[model samples]
Target chain A: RFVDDYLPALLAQASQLISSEFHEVARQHGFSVSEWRVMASLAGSEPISIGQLAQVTVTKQPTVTRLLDRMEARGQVERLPHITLVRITRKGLKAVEHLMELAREHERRVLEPFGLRRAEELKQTLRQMIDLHVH
Target chain B: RFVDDYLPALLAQASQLISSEFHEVARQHGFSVSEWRVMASLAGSEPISIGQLAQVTVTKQPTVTRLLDRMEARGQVERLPHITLVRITRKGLKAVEHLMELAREHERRVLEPFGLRRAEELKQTLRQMIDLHVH
Candidate 1:
């Protein structure tokens, strides 16, 4: 079956299923999925270029730029002058703090059935795939 | 860090990384990502409802409907009259055959580093996650 043997299809479906669960919570918190992704990517990190944000968040750079326009107006993120770098502001972190905890809790619940060790292995393998495939 | 510990982020990035590698090849063959998804989902399967296709392809129902309109016109899929189910045409199968082989080859290369046993474990874990999370 495609679901069983196709890696891309399997990974895509799995990612959608896992992410959609938290997407509802993000919506309730007034964040679009892209916004949530951007905020999550920015949490606990220094300012990064919009290009980097787009790559990590799996959003196009133009969309990321436009999202930053709204986010900057709302004081959720700051775009440094003369550069494409963006930072989640103190307000941004404050807003997303609870969501971050909830996200971790959700991840734990998803991985709980496989146990921590297997979950770690899964994550390690995924990270290795990312390192090998992504630039 | 978000990239290190977030399961959804990790999965999404890994999926994107791995899928993007094949997406270029898919594009060169004159198919959009959604089109490739629909064809892949239909291969070796009985006709499925539009709703099921939408769920499996991770596409919205309306978008899937629109895509099917184009695909049907192109003779790539046949939508049963007075029903929502769809099946791939022989032309569709022929068009996707090489792409399917390429996709598998891509997956093998991606999973090669971890060996087949570990890759199977990873895929099984992802399926478990999907079963637990997706309704």
Candidate 2:
């Protein structure tokens, strides 16, 4: 009955606090979390479909499209008309690269206390949960 | 550069998957996550300030106020009209009690795959990270 015994509450609370730093970064950049997620995904590689973007960004398609609409209007991304393909523009890449800098720094803040190996193990532990329950 | 190597990505993704079952129950019950969070917090004990509600729910002040507006209308919660206080109603208590059943079942599925000990340890590891980083 205790909230302390609640895993979902713990996970949600922890994730929110651990990511608060990055959330501020997104706020400073005037970007939605969905937009940052899509940008971060695109920063990794080539053009991707809306479907792929949705999966990686943990967003649904309609929401992704709306974010894309805004990002594209802001010159941060370009979606090929009548196609599912989308790519980050030079501006988009620049924004995400800076965002990643903030992210990596925040990651250090979160993990440096436990050291990298334990952080790796913690991430692996979460991955196991994801693989076990999500697939 | 693979998104797969990203720890935050893993945490967000896994948490999303693990909690999707709860989200479904919320959806079926017409509850927003914020409302559910507020209700769940109240299900514990005591009246809380909007500030305290925001913290436990991981929501910001304005959003919590807005959600409280809607929830108050539904007779699920009450706010001291001129003060920073709130509490759950009997209706809210009943809703969360049912929601907790679904959440507990989902937790079992997420943890039972690894057996109880490993699940306990995983939660511990996440708690350690939360404590170390969040402070």
Candidate 3:
């Protein structure tokens, strides 16, 4: 079926399922989905630009700026001097650690239906799509 | 290991991969991602509410409204008798069919490395996650 073959739709559905699952965890920590995305991307890498962060979160630049502004005011994120790079603060890292535990648990539940080998294979395929599909 | 374990990151990365690939095709057709999403949803279902369309696209209501407004203005989409129900115009349907062919071709490339059976299995697993993981 076209629906089954539609990659974007399938990705969006699964992505939203994961997002909704994490909503409570994020809300409990007073974070928006956008904020959580920024924190996670920061956790994976240091000193990323807002433009890069926007790409990471599949978010628009203005929205990323606004989220960063809120996080900055709350001492959870900081923009580096003389550069476009935005890095997480110590406080940000603390929050990320707490939230990521919840996120990891959520991931496990989502993949629990499939065994570990199958789940790992799925992740590998996703990574290859990201790596190879770009022009 | 943590990177491999993050579902949102993997989904976002792959989602962006597909989105970026389709950007030029959409641009050439003068349609935005949201427009394509609406048309595709409408392609599959009868007159559906904006709320329902938003769920299908995994897009928020406000953005969906804006995109639908633009599409309506351009004569590509229509709001039915009910204030909430929306449907694609013939023009919209044509564009959707054309664009979806390209999208399907893109999906074929993505799944080519996995072969047909494994690709179907992957899609089935994703659907199961969406169905089972939510509260």
- Tens digits of per-residue lDDT, candidate 2, A55-123, equal 667787898888889889999988874457998899988877877887887787777877776777777
RMSD (Å) per prediction: 1.7, 3.5, 3.5
User: lDDT tens digits, residues B1-135, model 2?
Assistant: 646666677777777777776787887987777777888888866787888778667788899999989999999999984458998999889877887777778778777877777777678877776666553
**Steric collisions counted per model:** 0, 0, 0
lDDT tens digits by residue: candidate 3, B79-104: 88675899878987877898888878
Off-target runs (Cα >4 Å) in candidate 1 are A81-83, B81-83
lDDT of 2 at B100: 74
Candidate 1 per-residue lDDT over residues B1-135, each given as its tens digit? 775678898899899888888999999988789989999889988989998888888898899999999999999999985467899999999998888888888888888889988999988888887777777
* Candidate 3: stretches off by over 4 Å: A44-52, A61-74, A78-86, B1-4, B44-50, B62-91, B133-135
DockQ of 1: 0.76
Predicted candidate 1 versus true structure: per-residue lDDT over A14-132, tens digit per residue: 99999999999999988889878988899999888887888789887888888989999999999985467898999989988888988989888888889988999999988888778
Residue B10 shift from truth in candidate 1, angstroms: 0.6
lDDT of 3 by residue, A22-101 (tens): 87789898888788888877885668777877776778889888888889999988898644789888888888888888
What's the residue-level lDDT of B121 in candidate 2? Answer: 69
Q: Pick the candidate with the highest DockQ.
A: 1
TM-score of model 1 vs. true structure: 0.94
Q: Evaluated on chain B only, what is the TM-score of candidate 3?
A: 0.84
Ranking by lDDT: 1, 3, 2
